Here is the input.
Amino acid sequence: RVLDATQLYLGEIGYSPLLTAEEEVYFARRALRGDVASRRRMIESNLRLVVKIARRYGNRGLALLDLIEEGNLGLIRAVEKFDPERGFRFSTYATWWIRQTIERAIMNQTRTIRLPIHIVKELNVYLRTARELSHKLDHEPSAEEIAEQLDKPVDDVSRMLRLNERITSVDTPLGGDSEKALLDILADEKENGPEDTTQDDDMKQSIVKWLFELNAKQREVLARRFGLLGYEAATLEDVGREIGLTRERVRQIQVEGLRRLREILQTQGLNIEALFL
Amino acid sequence: YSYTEKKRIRKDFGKRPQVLDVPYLLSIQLDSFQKFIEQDPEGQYGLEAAFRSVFPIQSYSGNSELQYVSYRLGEPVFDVQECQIRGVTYSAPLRVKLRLVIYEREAPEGTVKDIKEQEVYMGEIPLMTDNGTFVINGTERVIVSQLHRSPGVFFDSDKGKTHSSGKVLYNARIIPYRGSWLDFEFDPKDNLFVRIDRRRKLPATIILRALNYTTEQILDLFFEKVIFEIRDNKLQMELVPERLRGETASFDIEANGKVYVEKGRRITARHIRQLEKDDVKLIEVPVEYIAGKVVAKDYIDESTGELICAANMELSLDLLAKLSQSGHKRIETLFTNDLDHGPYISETLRVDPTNDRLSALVEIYRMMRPGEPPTREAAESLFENLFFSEDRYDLSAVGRMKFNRSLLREEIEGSGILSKDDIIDVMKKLIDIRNGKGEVDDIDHLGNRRIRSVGEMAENQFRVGLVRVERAVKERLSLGDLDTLMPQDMINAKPISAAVKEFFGSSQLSQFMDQNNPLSEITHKRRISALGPGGLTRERAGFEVRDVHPTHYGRVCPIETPEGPNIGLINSLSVYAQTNEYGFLETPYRKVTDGVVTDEIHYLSAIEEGNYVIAQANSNLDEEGHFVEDLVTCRSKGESSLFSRDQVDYMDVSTQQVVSVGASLIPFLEHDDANRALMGANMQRQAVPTLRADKPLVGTGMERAVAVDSGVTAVAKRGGVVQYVDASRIVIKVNEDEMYPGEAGIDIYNLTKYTRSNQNTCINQMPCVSLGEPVERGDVLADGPSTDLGELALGQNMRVAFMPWNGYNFEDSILVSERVVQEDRFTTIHIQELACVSRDTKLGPEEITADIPNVGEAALSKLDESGIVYIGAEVTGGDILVGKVTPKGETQLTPEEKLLRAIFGEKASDVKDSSLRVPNGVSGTVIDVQVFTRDGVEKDKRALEIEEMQLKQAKKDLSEELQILEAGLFSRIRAVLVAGGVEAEKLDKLPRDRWLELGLTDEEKQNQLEQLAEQYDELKHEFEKKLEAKRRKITQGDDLAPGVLKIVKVYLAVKRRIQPGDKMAGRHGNKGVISKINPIEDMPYDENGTPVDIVLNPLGVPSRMNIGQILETHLGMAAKGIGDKINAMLKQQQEVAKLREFIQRAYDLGADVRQKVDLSTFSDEEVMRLAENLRKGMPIATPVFDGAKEAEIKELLKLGDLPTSGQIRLYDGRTGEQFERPVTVGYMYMLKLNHLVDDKMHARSTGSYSLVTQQPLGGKAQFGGQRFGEMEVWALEAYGAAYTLQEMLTVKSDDVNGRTKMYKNIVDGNHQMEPGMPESFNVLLKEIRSLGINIELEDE
Amino acid sequence: VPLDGGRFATSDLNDLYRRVINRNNRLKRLLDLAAPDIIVRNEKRMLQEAVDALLDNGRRGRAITGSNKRPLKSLADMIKGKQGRFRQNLLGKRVDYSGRSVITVGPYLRLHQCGLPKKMALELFKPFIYGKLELRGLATTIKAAKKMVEREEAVVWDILDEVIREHPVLLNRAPTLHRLGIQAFEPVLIEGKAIQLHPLVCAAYNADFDGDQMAVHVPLTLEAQLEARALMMSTNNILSPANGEPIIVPS
Amino acid sequence: IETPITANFREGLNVLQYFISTHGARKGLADTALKTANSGYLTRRLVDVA
DNA sequence: TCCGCGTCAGACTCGTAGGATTATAGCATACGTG
DNA sequence: ACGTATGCTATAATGTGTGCAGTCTGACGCGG
Ligand SMILES: Nc1ccn([C@@H]2O[C@H](COP(=O)(O)OP(=O)(O)OP(=O)(O)O)[C@@H](O)[C@H]2O)c(=O)n1
Ligand SMILES: [Mg+2]
Ligand SMILES: [Mg+2]
Here is the structure.
């Protein structure tokens, strides 16, 4: 029989009212006053018109089935707000809706990184300006060549062209040979190998030994300021909250702790060795 | 002979004079693309075809239409020089003229209403170079010619679909160039079926009904007629004597007066002539004979008017009696035969559930569009659209040609659409083959495998651009306003541009040119593939395709194909092979006229090769006459045997036509196994050119042909004297005869100097000519990277000795002297290109300054203020080439870093570091740096210093152009002026700017002075706009990717030396790794003292069966022996006459040497320049199969005062005592393969980690550990080693806890197992849960 | 995740997910409108097409093709067959303390020995240098030891040389047919980018010195050092397990 | 092939003798690449059960 | 239960190489947070 | 006020199709 979701729906619309001028008015007049049956009919009837409008709006974002669904939603809003008393036809009024609802739904579900209409609307005019230029320049227009024709900012054009960049899939094969994808190459930003993990662990264990090698009143002031031992990273002035309660003596004692510690790094074998780092 | 040839002549051991000279090896690629751009006026080809095919396009209403007028190519925006550097396509503007014509609706056809006309751009097409390459995004790339099934008709049979029946089911299939497929196929019950697009199976009479054919007509077309007359009472029947042939007499066969055959007896050929000579026409028969016979046409009762019996119905006794009394005593029936004329359409109609034409178009429509209710038009439109519309269907020229000659037709050229005739004719020959006559075609025959080069493929992809525009034209025309809308508003230039760049990039045939060797370039351009789109697949590929087919002879090389899964599909073209005008291949053949082997040559197609008998090139000509021997070994019908003289029709032209270019360079191929020959030709393509191009002592002759045709060298367009020689360029003065009278006549050749290759190697062009040397037209002026005096120089020859050496040549392992390494002869060049990118991040823009945080003055020493390393600066891994800095965000300065940046200080600018530094390991010399900037943000100071040079160098270079062009232009006027008003010095008093002021008498030469005067001005005005183009393109800012602001590209110059791990080989597939570079003290040496260069293993020979290397060695030694004698006489400073006698005695030695070079013709000066190049060794040519034999080689060895054997008395270097017995020593031309160990070795302790699997990455490219696969795993399972495995599953791979924890434990010394459980499994749990499956880890 | 080139990249799952959510939310919208059933039917058929395409794309009908005319990789696909998690990202792994290089002959070596390049073993035994360095007191910390190694100073070679002695390394050749496809040796540092292998065990690997490469692996744990010396050592592996016959035989 | 190769590597093959040698050479090397997967797949099959 | 033909499952293991898309109007009040 | 989002336009128009079609041996699973 038929097992294609496409042809099944396309069959059921092929057995649905085809309304005349005065028929549309009769149903629409009752549809606004809520006849229930009437709203269902005008819709059922004009599903055929949605498909012919989605036959030119394809291969742009979603599939043909996806356009018909969102195109049907435009016909419904057209039925919610049609004027039967006006002598003008319905097929004319509904086309404005079905073309709009499709374009709009493509502008959202086409790009992975969601782009609102504002940035998109503008981008189109920049691209449609590129057409005119391209045909007469015979050269794909630059960010400048587009900015000179619109007399608009350079960064704007560039900023709008930076949002038009497409995205390749991580699982995409590499070079007419599905040997390795991009995931089998792309590194993990977050975790650096044990070498970098043990660097900080060993460097920060060496500091724990250097703070116990200093004075009791020199590590109690230096540590709690930087937030090394304490809970919050305070400043010269804020160390006064604890017991110091000083501004001059905190600054003399901070630097006194660091000067004795600079000699501890010159003797252990760092100083200028660990200065490049 | 020529001058460049006089410098060094190659001794040719050929004995089969070349009647056909080797062609330009790059014929296909250049001629193909030439067709594509070629604007043919009528005979549409390439673009002209694409437009006339699609256009004219008309609206969906049909009131408005767009019509193609004419197109053109503008000169390239950026030329090759520029394109290669910037990094954008070398393409030309496409300007096509369109015409928008609109009709009147109520009026008939008001064609003259608004004939709008304008010119429109759409897409820029990559042009082809003179080398047959396409410059795509600054890469010379090559498009490989495709090999696919030729359109038309084809008969096949699955030798046992159902081995249940084991019945050979025959099938036919119409393959178009564009359109739907049309197949016919039998079944176990011999019912003919038709499957359009190999969709549903439909009875084969349903398609005939669709072509309006009644049951009667169908039968009348296939089956013959058997006439039955019912005279009075006796039933009678027409007999063609040749019918009851090979059958049995089921009844008593008796005539006007005689019983011929008895019941149950076989009717033999005697009985058939017995009846045929008696002229028997009518025979009385029984009524039981018709029971079974099928009635042909319909038979209505004359009386009632009803069908007594419909057409195609098996008769019976009662039906026949019903027909006899109806009033029909003339019945027609089918001539059914289970052996010859088979009843198939008959039994098929009984299955066929259709009725008339209109109902036949229904099931055809219900097959392809199932579910849509059918109408009269929808069913008719579909079927008419399939194989019967000028739009959907197109067999093409080749399609109709093969289709016709497959049906043994009348026409070569006909219609693109299938006619009714065509279909039934195809069903007819399918049924012919089923009967017995007719043979099936096979796909492996090259008569069915057509070649499709680039130009035809560029045409195809250009059509899809036009097809995708067709959509936008029609829809915009109908609903859009007629007047306002202009034709370019409806055209889009992107769909064409995108569809063509799709081909010039993503396609499998468009791949990066393999240019690490002249042989690689020329053999990769002569590559032909069956893969990619519209071809085959490793997954789909069988064996019989791959297998060498006797059609390959002369057309395709038997020994040229990768040994990789793409083995039999990829193949190089043969030497003298060429494409048929239609598509198939064709090979040269010497015609034999009345026994006389005429020099007239005919390129026989793959089809006509089978027809004539073809003698081999082994056969002996009688010096203008015929075959010396009466019997000649020849070949035909794809088989080989001896034939007489008159029977021979054609002969192989040369002895090298069977093989390709790759194989034509292998000497003594004849003494080499095809398996090792293949590998040898495959590795010869991988031969990285050396520092100093060394000529091959043991060549074939094809050497020069390759080097020259490769387009890597610079050959003279016009002969004359080299006015100026230079490392960068060459200036040659043209002779009077060749020089044009209009222009000056001084050619300019700016030689390509050291720059990068696609494989990251050296490309140089050194002048092979001396200052002020007389050069002939078409002579090599500058040599390439792997060429020497025009001849190909891939690797280097050296004294080799075959013997074991303390296992340092174990399994083909190589033992090379340090003396080879001292001469730096196998030392190679590797120009590596690195880049530095300034991007625009979310935080802010990056720049390029010397200001880099956390750095030593030592790093910024080689940089300038701008932040780019100086030209000529040596660099090493860790040193920074180009200083870059990016913005630093919200960066969490960790407490331990805030304190460390507060102690030592240097509060690094809120600007991150990412300077381009030499990669860890690499070290060489910066030879140049190029800066690309967006047209905007202000530049670096070094970028201005480089602009200074480009400009002032271009101003000088153009000054030099107009200067030397002036001198050559007045040089003419000076000679013209003397003719007439003869005055020497008095004319040369005042300067040369007042020479156009002087004239001559009313004469042709007065018109000449006016030409040169106004052409001097033409160059004077041209010089300014030539300066404008240079100046602007230097000031011009280069378009970059979005986000990028500017880039700095660095060129290094790494010079890697040979070392253990380097892979080298001969050209006989003899591979090997260098194991040890032996000391000069330890190398074996002859009695005389000179040591050996390489020591090869003799056991890499018998098993290999590639004895060609040993002959290469023997001849190389003999050749060198002769050079050693000439070297000695030139050192001794002897005489011209003494060298002349010896060298004449050398060139003339072979049995019938092809070249007979007299030295009495050579002048004294020409002899000494020759001997000086012969001293390294007399270069010898051993044609592929017409090479030298032992008689010739051993005779040459006696001239060199070398041993007849080739084995020398060797002494061990380590010791000094002799080896127990002699060893073969000689000069073998070996190669340095691209597989160098510095580009291989890798190591890893801990590094990057994968993104989700959380195991390490892959490759030394990304610094990844070696993969331990399941096979590697089972190995440790077998051993029992459990931790060694668990260690390689967890801490070394995923286990995030384990890897870092174990690291800390190792530095502690405690190598302790600390497992957890790899991440990649934790992923697999959630991945199965995401599939809606409860997978939890159930505990103890 | 974003590329270095300002581009982004997404897995095909995200794309397949957006097909499911869009259609599911559109169904919520149409059930709000009380739309005719003919439309609701299409929406439900679509929703199922999307769900079925998310679980296993290429199965029920045509697999939903995406950008590069190729089919979207679904969920089931990452658990399916060779290219799945099992065979590719679990039973087989790329491994640390691993290096590979062109092999060449080692006719001077004994059976229990193999040439190992210095610069190779250098990087391979990186945490063992940092460890022996803190013991001698030459490095105070590990980033100090890191720089000592980087500068390739003379006295660091002698420490590297110390740890490697009495330390086995695994040498693998592809393909790994039988257990002998890996054998352990005592590394001998050699200046050169080539590995030097023992001629007699060449038979087990089927290693021809014509451009072969062999992967190196360092056994980290003491148990792995014992396992490598006890089970996987070349001397302890003579006869084939297939046939009680010596595979270690000259040629 | 009904007609084998008469010559050896010392005396040298003619043009066809080599053309003939190809047919056997390509098919022998085709079964080195393609037929290997069945044998290696057997190893895989055997292992899992054992 | 048996035969025919539809779908569905495999096809050895490690190393290297490089790139690019089309288009969704146009303008005026409605919804969310400093 | 700024960005996002929702809204409406009135000639008539009312059922899609597009695109690769020498794999192959072996094994079941629904009807017929
Ligand atoms: N496609 C390939 C090529 C090679 N190998 C491996 O490489 C080895 C050696 O291949 P090769 O050197 O070509 O074969 P040999 O038997 O050494 O023969 P030759 O004398 O031609 O070197 C094979 O046994 C095999 O382990 C492989 O597995 N798959
Ligand atoms: Mg090998
Ligand atoms: Mg080998």
